[PDB]
Design a protein around this nucleic acid. Sequence first.
DNA 1: CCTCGTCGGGGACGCTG
DNA 2: CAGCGTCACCGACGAG
Lengths: 299, 299
Amino acid sequence: GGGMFGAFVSHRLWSDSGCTTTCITNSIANYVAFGEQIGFPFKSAQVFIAGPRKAVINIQEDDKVELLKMIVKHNLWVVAHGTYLDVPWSRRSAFVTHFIQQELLICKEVGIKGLVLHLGAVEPELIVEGLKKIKPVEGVVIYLETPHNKHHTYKYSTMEQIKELFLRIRNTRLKQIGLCIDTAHIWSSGVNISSYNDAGQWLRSLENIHSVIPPSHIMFHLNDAATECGSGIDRHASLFEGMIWKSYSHKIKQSGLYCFVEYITRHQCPAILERNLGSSMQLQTALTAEFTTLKSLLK
Amino acid sequence: GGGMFGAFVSHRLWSDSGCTTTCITNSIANYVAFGEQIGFPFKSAQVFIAGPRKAVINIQEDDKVELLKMIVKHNLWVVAHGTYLDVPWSRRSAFVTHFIQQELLICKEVGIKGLVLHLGAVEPELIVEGLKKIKPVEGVVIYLETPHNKHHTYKYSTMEQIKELFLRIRNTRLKQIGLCIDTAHIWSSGVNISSYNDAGQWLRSLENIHSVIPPSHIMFHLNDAATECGSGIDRHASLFEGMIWKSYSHKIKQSGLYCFVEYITRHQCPAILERNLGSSMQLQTALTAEFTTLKSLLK
DNA sequence: CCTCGTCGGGGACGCTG
DNA sequence: CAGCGTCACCGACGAG
Ligand SMILES: [Zn+2]
Ligand SMILES: [Zn+2]
Ligand SMILES: [Zn+2]
Ligand SMILES: [Zn+2]
Ligand SMILES: [Zn+2]
Ligand SMILES: [Zn+2]
């Protein structure tokens, strides 16, 4: 197999109005159907199992059982984005760490392959401190997502900072820790990835530290951005419709995105499209454009 | 007689170099002599009897006796500008109100006809509340000077606010309260008085509330301004040398200043020229220019 | 139970009448 | 003392 492409599945916008106990499983079912209809069978997906605005578990025991069968039936590589309250490097991180411990156990329970956590603009020593309090579970790897700020030293969007972080992780013998790369986050953090060569040099530098972070522990969030490079604002957009790759609307194979797609296919990485909008028709309209553009890129 | 013109007499820049014995009286003598020399006998004067940077009485009992004889000898109309600490409507409204009682009693002791107090950017009732705490002394009237601010609500530079303020004063029947109009203060407070008619309508509006504030209790600070209209900055300048009446350097009888002089001559008001320069040579140079300009205006 | 950014109001400051 | 300009800080507010 090559790359494993997919999108973020909102419970609201994908679950059938008449679900009762297995709502998350139903949202996946319609999501899988949508891909087969548009001619792009998905191999990956991202969902919420909690929050994301409150540290509360959303899934139900009925949904757990049927979700595992749904994932195995369609051979899906699924991660769960943690709630926005998941910051192990905080003051009262005793509740938070236990809450993440719960999410990790559920992911193993239902066949989800990881949990995405946001990185703070904090020194790497504090990050591993919070990570040290988390006892891991097998089969589930914590993915650390690239943050987005403006006037903070620690951005974790340059390779020098990513290496230094994961070097401390490897020196601490911390198991099952990965990296999630959000193109919009590193772009709103100062890293210009518009042209093929600029994304090339960045990805080449990522490959140069594979001993610290191997591509087996790397996933991608393929997002365009409706903001400026270095602004520090998270405003996702559909591919080639935001300020990163809008200029490459009719030369898509010269864009920094195609260089990312080449990396994803080369290292068989997961790629998630996190874009949310007001309506189901609006979302499936944008998703049809993006995934048909990927279909042409993989043709 | 007509108007009573004069200037502010610093008891340093006018007293004999290194004065010790009766300095305020000596400063007046040279000030009177300076007028006789330049051909402009002064009828008014303004001095400090305290501060203005510290709540301490500067005059001495020796100076008191000779100053009274000096004032009567030349028939001078003298006021004392209060220190910058004189705010009866403040937190320390117990100490300040007693300090003013001291200054007020000294003015009667030496023949000074009033004390100038600055108005705050405060509601008018706090002002009369503070003024009600002051037991008056006869023959001495408290003159309230117009302030200078940009963003505060209360400017006391438009006639609508002056009227309600002094209306509040008359309704409380507290005696011996006057008004001091600083052309530079009301100008840096938003009131353009550059042209003859603009000063005309403002002074005309002052005459319209003569039942509330009679011209017998009105004095003037004739200052140009080295700032912009409405800036909120107190920067005095010589007449026709600042940003108010510089445009009327060779058409002085078409300026708003001449309209003020007409008012002063009409109601026999005192007019004080407050100039802060560097040396005695700098000050007496600027004063000769202004007072000779007034000499031509009164010809 | 988290953080980003922005925006807009509050107080601190070393001036100057 | 009470003005101003300047500006950082705290506290709301939508984000994701
Ligand atoms: Zn995220
Ligand atoms: Zn993301
Ligand atoms: Zn994002
Ligand atoms: Zn004054
Ligand atoms: Zn004045
Ligand atoms: Zn002034």
